[PDB]
Design an enzyme around this catalytic site. Structure first.
Site, PDB file in Angstrom:
ATOM      1  CG  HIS A  41      -2.078  -1.025   1.065  1.00  0.00           C
ATOM      2  ND1 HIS A  41      -2.654  -1.391  -0.123  1.00  0.00           N
ATOM      3  CD2 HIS A  41      -2.726  -1.734   2.028  1.00  0.00           C
ATOM      4  CE1 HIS A  41      -3.569  -2.322   0.103  1.00  0.00           C
ATOM      5  NE2 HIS A  41      -3.634  -2.553   1.398  1.00  0.00           N
ATOM      6  CG  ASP A  89      -0.277  -4.215   2.602  1.00  0.00           C
ATOM      7  OD1 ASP A  89       0.205  -3.727   1.545  1.00  0.00           O
ATOM      8  OD2 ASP A  89      -0.503  -3.551   3.680  1.00  0.00           O
ATOM      9  CB  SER A 183       1.694   1.209   6.634  1.00  0.00           C
ATOM     10  OG  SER A 183       0.396   1.532   6.983  1.00  0.00           O
ATOM     11  N   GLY A 184       3.984  -1.032   7.191  1.00  0.00           N
ATOM     12  CA  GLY A 184       5.213  -1.595   6.618  1.00  0.00           C
ATOM     13  C   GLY A 184       6.297  -1.834   7.644  1.00  0.00           C
TER      14      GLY A 184
HETATM   15  C1  LIG Z   1       0.151   5.930   4.534  1.00  0.00           C
HETATM   16  C2  LIG Z   1      -0.538   5.035   3.484  1.00  0.00           C
HETATM   17  C3  LIG Z   1      -0.048   3.581   3.624  1.00  0.00           C
HETATM   18  C4  LIG Z   1      -2.095   5.176   3.428  1.00  0.00           C
HETATM   19  C5  LIG Z   1      -2.804   4.639   4.671  1.00  0.00           C
HETATM   20  O1  LIG Z   1      -3.083   3.458   4.798  1.00  0.00           O
HETATM   21  N1  LIG Z   1      -3.102   5.514   5.519  1.00  0.00           N
HETATM   22  C6  LIG Z   1      -3.644   5.375   6.800  1.00  0.00           C
HETATM   23  C7  LIG Z   1      -4.409   6.367   7.340  1.00  0.00           C
HETATM   24  C8  LIG Z   1      -4.866   6.253   8.655  1.00  0.00           C
HETATM   25  C9  LIG Z   1      -4.506   5.165   9.447  1.00  0.00           C
HETATM   26  C10 LIG Z   1      -3.689   4.150   8.900  1.00  0.00           C
HETATM   27  C11 LIG Z   1      -3.221   2.996   9.724  1.00  0.00           C
HETATM   28  C12 LIG Z   1      -1.916   2.502   9.515  1.00  0.00           C
HETATM   29  C13 LIG Z   1      -1.484   1.503  10.362  1.00  0.00           C
HETATM   30  C14 LIG Z   1      -2.300   0.956  11.360  1.00  0.00           C
HETATM   31  C15 LIG Z   1      -3.564   1.463  11.584  1.00  0.00           C
HETATM   32  C16 LIG Z   1      -4.507   0.950  12.641  1.00  0.00           C
HETATM   33  N2  LIG Z   1      -3.925   0.019  13.605  1.00  0.00           N
HETATM   34  C17 LIG Z   1      -4.015   2.501  10.788  1.00  0.00           C
HETATM   35  C18 LIG Z   1      -3.254   4.299   7.601  1.00  0.00           C
END
Ligand SMILES: CC(C)CC(=O)Nc1cccc(-c2cccc(CN)c2)c1
Length: 228
Positions: A41, A89, A183-184
């Site tokens: 993502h 992912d 993320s990641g």
């Molecule tokens: C930055 C990009 C990969 C786009 C995206 O996915 N955004 C986004 C926005 C709000 C919460 C989150 C999010 C991430 C990691 C964990 C969690 C909830 N444990 C939420 C992720």
């Protein structure tokens, strides 16, 4: 990371910041000399931005002798990843050159044996994502310990409603949670990489919506094949 603490500088030498246009976008994990594992993502919407990997970092802004920025030669998303699902992912990023290994830059061994982490096990999650509900972004790396939640509870209707496959795991999200920009990054249990942070949903820190992590052991054959 919501409800966490600043980490000890360079105590997680595997930790990577995946960057777009000079800014932190996603977490990642150094898994071999020339490869960083992150989430797919992250690279949707990269399109002609400068995609780079920062290793050896603690502060994103301040200078540090171990900090080094690497270009990406090749990015390999898992071929079954899609922008509208939480499945598969994973992303492998090949650096422009072998990373310079050192006290602050070192690969993290990752779980190859497909066995669920037992419920209640406390796993370490780290990243430079937001730290509260007012959108504050930290300068330095944060971390938190999260208990693994069993898949059947995670899959109840009031939680994620059957969406958690055998290739995903969950952790409690009650006021402590991975959030936007994490993320990641790594979920580490028993000193080994077990998970990569993903999200299907914007909400952070809500007990009713546990954090979701892709189980790397579940993709062990694919990871090995790309690394060769
Ligand atoms: C930055 C990009 C990969 C786009 C995206 O996915 N955004 C986004 C926005 C709000 C919460 C989150 C999010 C991430 C990691 C964990 C969690 C909830 N444990 C939420 C992720």
């Amino acid at each position: 990371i919501l409800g966490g603490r600043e980490a000890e500088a360079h105590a997680r030498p595997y930790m990577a910041s995946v960057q777009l246009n000079g800014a932190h976008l996603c977490g990642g994990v150094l898994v071999a000399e020339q490869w960083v594992l992150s989430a797919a993502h992250c690279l949707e919407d990269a399109a002609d931005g400068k995609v780079q990997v920062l290793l050896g970092a603690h502060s994103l802004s301040q200078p540090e002798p171990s900090k080094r920025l690497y270009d990406v030669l090749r990015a390999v998303p898992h071929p079954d990843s899609q922008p509208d699902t939480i499945d598969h992912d994973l992303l492998l990023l090949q650096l422009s050159e072998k990373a310079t290994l050192g006290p602050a830059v070192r690969p993290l061994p990752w779980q190859r044996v497909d066995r669920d982490v037992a419920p209640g096990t406390l796993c370490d999650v780290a990243g430079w994502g937001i730290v509260n509900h007012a959108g504050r972004r930290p300068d330095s790396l944060q971390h938190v310990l999260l208990p693994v939640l069993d898949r059947a509870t995670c899959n109840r209707r009031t939680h994620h409603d059957g969406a958690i496959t055998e290739r995903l795991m969950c952790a409690e999200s009650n006021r402590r949670d991975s959030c936007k920009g994490d993320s990641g990054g790594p979920l580490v249990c028993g000193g080994v990489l077990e998970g990569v942070v993903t999200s299907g949903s914007r909400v952070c820190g809500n007990r009713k919506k546990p954090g979701i992590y892709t189980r790397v052991a579940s993709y062990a054959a694919w990871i090995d094949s790309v690394l060769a």
